[PDB]
Amino acid sequence: MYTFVVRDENSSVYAEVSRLLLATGQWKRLRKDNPRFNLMLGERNRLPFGRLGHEPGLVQLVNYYRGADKLCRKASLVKLIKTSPELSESCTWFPESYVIYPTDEREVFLAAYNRRREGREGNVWIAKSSGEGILISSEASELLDFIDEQGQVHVIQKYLEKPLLLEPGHRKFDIRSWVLVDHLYNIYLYREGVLRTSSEPYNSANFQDKTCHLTNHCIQKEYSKNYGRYEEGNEMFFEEFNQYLMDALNTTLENSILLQIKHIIRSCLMCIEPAISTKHLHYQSFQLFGFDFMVDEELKVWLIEVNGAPACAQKLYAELCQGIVDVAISSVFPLAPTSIFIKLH
Amino acid sequence: MEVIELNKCTSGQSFEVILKPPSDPSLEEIQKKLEAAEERRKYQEAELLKHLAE
Amino acid sequence: MRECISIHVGQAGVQIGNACWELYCLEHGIQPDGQMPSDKTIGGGDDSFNTFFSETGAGKHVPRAVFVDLEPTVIDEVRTGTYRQLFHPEQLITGKEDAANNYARGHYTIGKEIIDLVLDRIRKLADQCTGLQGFLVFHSFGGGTGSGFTSLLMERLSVDYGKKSKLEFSIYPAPQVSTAVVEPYNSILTTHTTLEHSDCAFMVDNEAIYDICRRNLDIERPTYTNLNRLISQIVSSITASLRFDGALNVDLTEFQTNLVPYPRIHFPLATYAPVISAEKAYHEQLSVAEITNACFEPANQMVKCDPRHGKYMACCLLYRGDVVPKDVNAAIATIKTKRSIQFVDWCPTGFKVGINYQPPTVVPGGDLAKVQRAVCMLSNTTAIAEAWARLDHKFDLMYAKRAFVHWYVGEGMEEGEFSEAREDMAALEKDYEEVGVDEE
Amino acid sequence: REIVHIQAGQCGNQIGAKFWEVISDEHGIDPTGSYHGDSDLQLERINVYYNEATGNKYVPRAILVDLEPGTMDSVRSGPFGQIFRPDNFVFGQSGAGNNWAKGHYTEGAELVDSVLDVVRKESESCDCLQGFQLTHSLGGGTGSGMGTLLISKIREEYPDRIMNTFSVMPSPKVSDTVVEPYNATLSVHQLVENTDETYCIDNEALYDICFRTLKLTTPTYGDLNHLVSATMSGVTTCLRFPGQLNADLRKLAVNMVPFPRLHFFMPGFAPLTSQYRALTVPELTQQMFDSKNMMAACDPRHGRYLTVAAIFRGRMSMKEVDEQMLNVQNKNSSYFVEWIPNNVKTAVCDIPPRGLKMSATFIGNSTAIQELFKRISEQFTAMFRRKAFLHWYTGEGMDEMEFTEAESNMNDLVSEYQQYQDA
């Protein structure tokens, strides 16, 4: 039977898949530093990719793509979109962003900050990094006084001050999608996304208040007073959200939003494919991703962030983790029908 | 690209393609090293023969 | 004309020396009896092949080579083999008992008793040189002779031939054909003692050539003969510029100048293509673009590693066969658009190309098919540091328990040399990182 | 590179005789020392064990030692009796009476200089003496007491040579006298200090293999020795035939001994014979690692493998051999220490043993061997706590302290094997 190791135990997604690898009766778990494994559920930082693929008679698989960080970090993602001709900088689905260090884009950021000031256009930006930085203001002076006071590198992004608001509530949200890329670089979009919503009504005049602006589940658990009114855990799933779009907007989730999501996912992953592919390597990689999208008043989808080590919604842990075994693991190590994923590419 | 320093002959050809511009122990010490190990090797054997003599 | 002296140390060094010098004779048309009807200057000359072959009054062309092994079995094959008339007995040196896969036994115990014999034999070849330019040393990382004696020889060579170039062809240990468990120890120890004495070292991982023999040559269980005949082709394409007319890498200093801007980082990655089985009845010859593209495929490298996640410092393309510069340039332009080729920002993104019109020679009856054009790429990428990491990790596993260290101490070596050698590899590993790397 | 062979005592000479009987057949040498073989692989490394006389006769480099003439005469008249060098028979008349002290201090001390003279004349004619191999039991007196005396004297004279033994461990299941634990414990203390490699051959395992596997209801010593000579031939295949792995005694010791005191090996052989269908490569690999095929009577699942050496004899595919070896350790990797990477090395030899078309011999340095020394230690202490049978030894000049020291040193060896079983 097959063997595997675990090198990131505080991973809720992969703690469940290793539990499923037990029930099959055909996978044995080894200790962290046992090299005779077929599968590595590797650590999050400094994963020793260089030691993989050098064990005679062992097909070895790992749950991360070397080089995928260029997509899963704020600073590198901005650079990747700005310089890759496949994304061509002027792609319409990414907000205007500049990398300001505490090489440098401080000059060009202030240049666009003046253009927005001249036309009297909406000039609100956000400051984020790799915890939480939580700065939204209308003047760049307050942005930089906060950036240099902080240690790590922050990246400024145009705030989408005209977001799509859910009713009843007048509240914003973010859409999380889970994408699995297997050893063949097929791109599977899990049928079930989740909306991480805000509990308080959106307010344009109070940017210092960061509860109706930040849709993070940890912040809604911490600062929201009426958290949990409309949906359990500020999480609305697709069947309800799609029903809302039909009743309120006479459209569907697939037509209004999901087409753009599938396009954004396909674009980002097809861009870095030649840099991270393990098609002809001595080891092979798969990886689960968490894409974070934003929707505006005109049903335009914006990519906000890609998470390389995502968690899952509690309701969707079982279905998604079993899908990883079927699609990403048993595809390389078979055992002894409709799919839950959407093959893109 | 740019080809520079193209040199030809009947045997073959060489050149250079540019795409983007930029942006000791002595003999005495060695003999001492080997003799230091030789003495350590002889000291260990002497302790063995001393141990066997006992 | 500047002569080159090849030194073959240990079983791996000697058997690869056989594969290479056999191939050299087939390439220059030298018969097994040392005679070359192509040479019309009998008894001497300043031709390109004269850097590797000297001439006698009888017209024999003799390799400028010395074979050294602490054990007579492998070299006795040469004394009675096909090319027994090629070398004279002085060039073949054999000891009584070997180093038993023990670096200290090869370096200290047996090294001391034979190092002056070897150097005097090397002096005999050096005195026949009007202007010796340096040495090419073939050895294994894993063996007690190949590791222990080589590092001692490389120390003395720097003493007796100061600032004369020394290039290595080193065999990285792979468990699929390895014979000893302590080869990580031997590898780290010999790399520590040799680092400052080597100007440029080409590492060949036996694992890489083993798989290439299985995939491309369809060989079930590759033997050392399979491995060495493939290695010799790579060595021949690297030393071809020293043996033939040309303008790229015509002396040993140019290897350091072209590939080694940082002296400690002198381990270029070699990639070779195409490798085609001779038993393959039907074959479609590959183009310049196809074989150049294969130079950026990990499956064709001498050390398995991912250059996409390192940074380049230099690139040499060495072609043999029907190749004109127009095809190379059109291929490099196509490859730059489709592949991840990241140079360090202080080096220029460039390629030094050399073309030898003579197609590569294959031993008749060998496993390699004769191809119309081939290429060997020498690229100094920081990705080769993955090979150091693997080795250092296996070293760390055994040393934490002090497993087997008593064998080395028993030969006179101090336990501290393990630490000094491992600290050096750590520094080397950090050097590569400085050069190549920048619940959600 | 020559090996000098020494067999001491009743057991050592009887087992040693079968060994020379087996390998002489494998090298195509008749009982008269003449070579009548069909392959040059037989003669390629024949000098490791045989000297050459005029007329192209091959004389074993073997020295026969015993304190009574009984077994010596039996060997001289048995099969392959006259192949041995006549003056290489060194024997006394008193005997050792199954008494380690008599072999090591009194009776054997009177005879040891004669043996070292024969050892010296055999070594002086060696081109490059590789080392010595000794066959003996630990439960008797001559092979146990005088055997370990010889090792101590040989090490004093040839201190940079590899010392190898095939040591038969006693067992109450195949016992001659009750004092066997005493002689065995005294001998282990000597072996821990003065040998580089020791193949632990447990007479309990040999009996059980003859009883349960080979279906021998009333096994004899000859049955047990058929098993010993078969594994002795297998573990020395790498030394007698052209090969790359473990081809000499020092290289084997460097690959098998990670720590100086832990040099006691478990041998294993497959298939077990006492044969018409040839065995497959998967079948050889499964059997050679099974406990039932082990000669040391230790379950390898009770410990972990420090290093493992395996040899395959016969015409087979090295591909399926590598696949099966990698399969058995990739699916039992918990029983191999993780701090010695790639601690399993495999060799192949085209020459199969007699009667078998395929065979596999196993050499393991497992921490499970402590089970053997713990058995001996418990049998030792059970008598020694009442000082039982001690007068046989104190009558030969020994003190109780020497027993306490051998006991303590062997308990340390057990504790040291338990140390590395945890990591």
Ligand SMILES: Nc1nc2c(ncn2[C@@H]2O[C@H](COP(=O)(O)OP(=O)(O)OP(=O)(O)O)[C@@H](O)[C@H]2O)c(=O)[nH]1
């Ligand atoms: N590619 C290749 N590798 C070899 C060859 N011979 C030995 N090796 C490798 O070399 C390593 C062992 O070192 P050797 O060269 O055999 O040993 P040595 O230099 O003779 O030193 P000692 O025998 O210990 O005195 C192992 O990793 C082998 O795989 C060969 O002919 N070709």
Ligand SMILES: Nc1ncnc2c1ncn2[C@@H]1O[C@H](COP(=O)(O)OP(=O)(O)CP(=O)(O)O)[C@@H](O)[C@H]1O
């Ligand atoms: N340009 C923008 N316009 C509008 N809202 C934005 C925005 N950028 C960020 N946000 C809001 O900020 C929230 C947090 O952003 P981000 O995803 O960077 O935080 P984070 O990375 O710490 C959480 P995670 O663990 O999912 O990576 C988003 O959910 C989104 O609602």
Ligand SMILES: Nc1nc2c(ncn2[C@@H]2O[C@H](COP(=O)(O)OP(=O)(O)O)[C@@H](O)[C@H]2O)c(=O)[nH]1
């Ligand atoms: N396997 C095997 N064991 C033996 C043989 N002869 C004796 N023994 C064992 O060896 C021990 C007695 O040793 P023995 O050789 O007779 O003593 P010695 O002649 O004084 O050295 C007991 O444990 C016996 O079981 C034999 O031929 N084969």
Ligand SMILES: [Ca+2]
């Ligand atoms: Ca000439």
Ligand SMILES: [Mg+2]
């Ligand atoms: Mg994040």
Ligand SMILES: [Mg+2]
């Ligand atoms: Mg050797």
Ligand SMILES: [Mg+2]
């Ligand atoms: Mg008896």
